[PDB]
Design a protein around this ligand. Structure first.
Ligand code: DTP
Ligand code: MN
Ligand code: MN
Ligand code: ZN
Length: 384
């Protein structure tokens, strides 16, 4: 019921929202003129009403407007050529997005075809490991393959995670280059009319090998125990749909003679590595095994979020109105331990604040601000 939110939001924006850390972030050291003043913010108010092209002069101005409007959620957009809140006085064609963080949005709902426990916006500990693998796979590539140093991972508050890549030269990337980065990171392709969504080449690129090796660390506990993807014929038929027909019968017989998913996976790998893809040559390998693991575990991005320079994205420390959860930074050093269900709601921290220094340090929000500050300290070091 979003009728209790206004009272809780007013307290949150008055005593708990981390304004000074937030401004340290988006002011980026104050080195570039008008960088914060030219940032678009988009507030959502009651009744799904929202406003585009809000912008503020400084931290005090942001605080006062957030505390005046108490928005249900806050989205961050690009840095523009002029003040967004003056964009109607700008000659046509001159008001232009110029810079923005490279962002990623990952939605558990995009995995429904390979999730057995949950569907739609639901999540649980048995499928959250998909996000753990997505963070590790994507973050490794952003850090090691692209050399991006300033990466803020955030729980979106309901069904997934965000990443904000904030390096100086990343923020200037064109939409076309952003799109190229997405394609580099993408392997799972196809809608609901495409049964087999992953096709690998004979020689696998090191990004693919390294991503497979990450999944291999999690696959037994995630796919074979928690999801039990080969529990019975209803489940293992979905996997047989991803391999050549000419081995279904052999695998059916092995599955029926095995006791559990662990044993049945071992048989699939043995058979798959004996399949002859090209009768021309005598070359064999684990391509099928890899294509299955990738289809079930490899990150699926909400790609349109990443391609557009102008694209809004929900802010860190925004409330998610549908759950009350605060969109909190994720401690990269404890990603395996992240529990979305310990993430505090706005109701929970407002209760803590006044249960028997009146700021977020009295509440469960404090450790999440600490992660944010570590990210901000690295940005500070990078500028001196
Ligand atoms: N009406 C809209 N106008 C502009 N941008 C929007 C709108 N709706 C969604 N978006 C963009 C910005 C959002 O931050 C982004 C992600 O949407 P979505 O994944 O559904 O929510 P979310 O990532 O904030 O939380 P969650 O996925 O956990 O529910 O898409
Ligand atoms: Mn999302
Ligand atoms: Mn989305
Ligand atoms: Zn689940």
């Amino acid at each position: 019921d979003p009728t209790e939110l206004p009272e809780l939001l007013k307290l949150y924006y008055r005593r708990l929202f981390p304004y000074s850390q937030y401004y340290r972030w988006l002011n980026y050291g104050g080195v570039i003129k008008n960088y914060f003043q030219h940032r678009e913010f988009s507030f959502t108010l009651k009744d799904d009403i929202y406003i585009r092209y809000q912008s503020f002069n400084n931290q005090s101005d942001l605080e006062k407007e957030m505390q005046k409007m108490n928005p249900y959620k806050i989205d961050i957009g690009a840095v523009y050529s002029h003040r967004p809140n003056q964009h109607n006085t700008v000659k046509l064609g001159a008001f232009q997005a110029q810079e923005k963080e490279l962002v990623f949005d990952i939605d558990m709902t995009d995995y429904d075809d390979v999730r057995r426990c949950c569907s739609s916006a639901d999540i649980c500990p048995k499928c959250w490991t998909l996000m753990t693998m997505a963070i590790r796979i994507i973050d490794r590539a952003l850090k090691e393959d692209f050399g991006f140093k300033h990466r803020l991972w955030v729980y979106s508050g309901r069904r997934g995670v965000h990443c904000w890549v904030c390096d100086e030269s990343v923020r200037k990337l064109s939409s076309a280059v952003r799109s190229g980065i997405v394609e580099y990171l993408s392997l799972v392709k196809g809608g609901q009319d495409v049964k087999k969504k992953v096709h690998l080449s004979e020689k696998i690129h090191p990004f693919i090998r390294k991503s497979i090796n990450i999944i291999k660390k999690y696959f037994e506990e995630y796919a074979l125990v928690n999801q039990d993807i080969l529990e019975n014929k209803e489940s293992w038929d979905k996997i047989l749909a991803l391999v050549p027909e000419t081995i279904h019968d052999e695998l059916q017989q092995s599955f029926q003679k095995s006791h559990n998913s662990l044993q049945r996976w071992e048989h699939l790998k043995k058979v798959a590595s004996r399949y002859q893809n090209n009768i021309k040559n005598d070359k064999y390998g684990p391509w099928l095994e890899w294509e299955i693991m990738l289809q079930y575990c490899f990150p699926r991005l909400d790609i349109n979020v990443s391609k557009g320079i102008n694209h809004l994205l929900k802010s860190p420390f925004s409330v998610h109105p549908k759950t009350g959860r605060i969109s909190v930074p994720i401690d990269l050093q404890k990603v395996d331990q992240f529990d979305p269900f310990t993430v505090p709601t706005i109701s929970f921290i407002c209760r803590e604040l006044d249960a028997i220094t009146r700021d977020y340090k009295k509440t469960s929000l404090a450790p999440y601000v600490k992660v944010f500050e570590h990210f901000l300290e690295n940005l500070d070091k990078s500028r001196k």
